[model samples]
Target: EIFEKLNTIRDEVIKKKNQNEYYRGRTKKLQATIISTKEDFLRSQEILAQTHLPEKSVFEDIDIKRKEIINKEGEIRDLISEIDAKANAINHEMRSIQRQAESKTKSLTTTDKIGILNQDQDLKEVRDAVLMVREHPEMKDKILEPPIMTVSAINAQFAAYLAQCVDYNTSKALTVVDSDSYKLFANPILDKFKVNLRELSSADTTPPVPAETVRDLGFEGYLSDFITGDKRVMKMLCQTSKIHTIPVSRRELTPAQIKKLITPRPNGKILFKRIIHGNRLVDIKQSAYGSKQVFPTDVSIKQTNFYQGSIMSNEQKIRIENEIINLKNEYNDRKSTLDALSNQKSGYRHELSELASKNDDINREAHQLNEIRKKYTMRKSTIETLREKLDQLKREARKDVSQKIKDIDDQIQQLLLKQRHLLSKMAS
Candidate 1:
């Protein structure tokens, strides 16, 4: 009975911990929202910066930027509408979690004697759950389900996301989203995780990534274990949704595969040519390479008319082409560096297995040495090895900024090039 009482307290603590983690995840989302918002603001500011026409007043430049932004606003509206319609088809994990929480806490009131009794009872129950978790960490992820709501939110967000990608018949938009995340919303989500026995690594960024970014990435099932974690959510997302999630990251795909995804076709609307880096996405940049002829005849005519004017020049067109080449190079370069780092990480991980075996042998041998002297040496060596391992793990844990930054740089470069190129092409 005492054990059970203690177990109940432990369970409550664990449940509380889980709930705490859930809120923490939410906090991360909020933080991500802030960072993302700032990023967008910064991007808009940067994009506006390009419009600084010394020849025209700020009002005129603003008018031009406004037109550009207005056109892009509608690109995903239909997809967004379809997502709203499909809401019923997906698992309502958010509602389920909220309901569970409400059901568990609804009856309790300070005035009621039962309130205390229930608390005590629930505490005992929670403790039991905690014990179960400790004893069988791998039993199944469901014994604790605090992350369910989080999963729901993530799934909902990504469900719409995948639908958007599907409409475009392109997966380029989700490069930042994990390849396997599609599986969380579909079966065998991680099954498609393009694991390159080759190498993988995150980019270099200071202050590390905030948890918000991590959670955003998680919604996309960015990690291999992400789907495995909160299996309840993953199962629900997969079973309810028809869009099977394929595991893939931009880096995981071959250059040919990437070209296929990004290569523009004669029909501009359906082709996969867009790129996503960090929080910014540009349709024009991706579409630019898909081929000029792919554009609508009317639009092409307008582009031609605009470029014929003396204001646009060949230098601009060359600059845009140069930007495309730069983006391709940047993507490849970072990918290579990331692969090397990931390989190094994998090697370091392998060493841990070896160290574990060696440690076991050392422990056994220390007893036979009859020298208390060897004990210190063994312990010291173990500590030193562990410290090194920890440092290596920290290094591996660092985020990869190459892809994200490259996206921004590429976008800016491409836009400038497009304007310049269009002007030059029309002039001839």
Candidate 2:
């Protein structure tokens, strides 16, 4: 019987709480309007006081105008009083109902405590629902930080290396954007070496690589050779060779190191032939039969256009040729570096594929789980709203019903004094 009575009191308190919320919202709007009007009245009096009345203006008329303004201010004060009266009444009723509800529940019986514990258990179930819906294992790897054997990790490394090579080469060549010149000069070579191994790894196909080109361009021999067949070779290298222990910063070759690894084609050189024609002495054959002979051999020479030459002197030409060779060598080195990195990633194909397949079922469950999580998210939001409402009620419990009206009365008194001061200025 006491339980039923307490429940009825709770329902009544809820009703009163809802009414209090509605009245508070309405009162806030009314307060804003009142505040705005009070400011407008002050500004209006200031403007009137500042008006350029003629020196011959009737001072009696100005005094009457001031009284009219004071009367209007009085009317605003009266409206404020009326609003406070109604607000105080509602506040008093809201407090009375809440007090009765609290009094009824304050000394709960063992049965009531059991009921409350049951309610708490029900709330726990709601929390469990949210936890079950939102809980998921970490499925995706951090970018570029996946296990070395994973497809995502391998591909991420490949891309990073490729980007490094491109930046190294392009910075030297001064062509950052992949322009037409880059396409013509670089893409033909670069296309042969992309590291999008995820797809090929899934298919279990050996990564296609231009191994010879990579070697010629100066990739580390063993690593480049390993990528063409078994991917495990790279993993073995990572483990046995202690590739994992190497600092991440040291993994990528510096641009200077890359440049040093390449060899450039030699510049074709112009050949010059010179033939000379001149007199010469020779021994007589008849006399030589009887005795050994000494003689000067005849020589014939002609000078032909050697490099039918460029305006560049030999020294300048040599310098330019060296410069071009350096450029060509760097270009090939970067290309080979790109291929080597791609092949490196290709070595992890099978493992990546297996991981992907393993996650397929989990992936399917992910979407449904996400939906359930969204539903629970809405439930949590409603819980939070109720919590905020409960907090508001607690605050209202401590407030005196007449105190708010007293505050409003104090504000009105201050406003009236300010208005009267403005009116006195007009009188002067």
Model 1 TM-score, all chains together: 0.13
Global CA lDDT computed for model 1: 0.36
Query: Model 2, poorest ten-residue lDDT window?
Result: 267-276
In the range 300-383, model 1's lDDT, one tens digit per residue, is 111111101122234542245445545654665565555556556555655654565565456445434434544544544454
Most lDDT-accurate candidate: 1
Give the per-residue lDDT of model 2 (tens digit) for 254-316: 323432223332211111011111111111122356444322222322321111112123453
Index of the highest-TM-score prediction: 1
Q: Candidate 1, residue 345: CA error in Å?
A: 74
The estimated TM-scores of all candidates read 0.13, 0.13
